[PDB]
Design a protein around this ligand. Structure first.
Ligand SMILES: *[C@@H]1O[C@H](CO)[C@@H](O[C@@H]2O[C@H](CO)[C@@H](O)[C@H](O)[C@H]2NC(C)=O)[C@H](O)[C@H]1NC(C)=O
Lengths: 48, 48
C-alpha cells in the first residue's frame, strides 16, 4: 500500500537533501542528481 | 589513503559520494587498477 503525494505549484530544492540526512543509497536514474536544480519538470510524484 | 569499507565503491570512475566528490575524484578516462584490503589489526589499538 503506497501513497502518491502529488506535488505541484511550488519551488523545490535538492541541495538541502544531500547533507542533513546521510542516505544509505541514492541512485538517480535517467537524471544525474547534481543537475536537478536547473530544469522544470511536470507533475512530480512521491512514493513511500 | 584509507577509507571505510562502505565507501570503497565510491572511489571508482563515474561514481558519487561525499569523499569521491569532495576529497578525491577519479577521471572518467582512468586506465588503472584499484586495490583494497583491510588492515584491522593495524587500525586497532588500546587508545584508538
Ligand atoms: C526531518 O529531518 C531533517 C534532518 O534530516 C530536519 O532538518 C533539520 O531541521 C532543523 C529544524 O528546522 C534545522 O535546524 C536543521 O538545519 C535541519 N538539518 C540540517 C542538517 O540542516 C527536518 O527539520 C526534519 N523534518 C521534519 C518535518 O521533522
Amino acid at each position: 500500500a503506497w501513497n502518491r503525494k502529488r506535488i505541484s505549484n511550488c519551488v523545490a530544492d535538492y541541495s538541502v537533501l544531500y547533507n542533513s540526512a546521510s542516505f544509505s543509497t541514492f541512485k538517480c536514474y535517467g537524471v544525474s542528481p547534481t543537475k536537478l536544480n536547473d530544469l522544470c519538470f511536470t507533475n512530480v510524484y512521491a512514493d513511500s | 589513503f584509507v577509507i571505510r569499507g562502505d565507501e570503497v565503491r565510491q572511489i571508482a570512475p563515474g561514481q558519487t559520494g561525499k569523499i569521491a566528490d569532495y576529497n578525491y575524484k577519479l577521471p572518467d578516462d582512468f586506465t588503472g587498477c584499484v586495490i583494497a584490503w583491510n588492515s584491522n589489526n593495524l587500525d586497532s589499538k588500546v587508545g584508538g
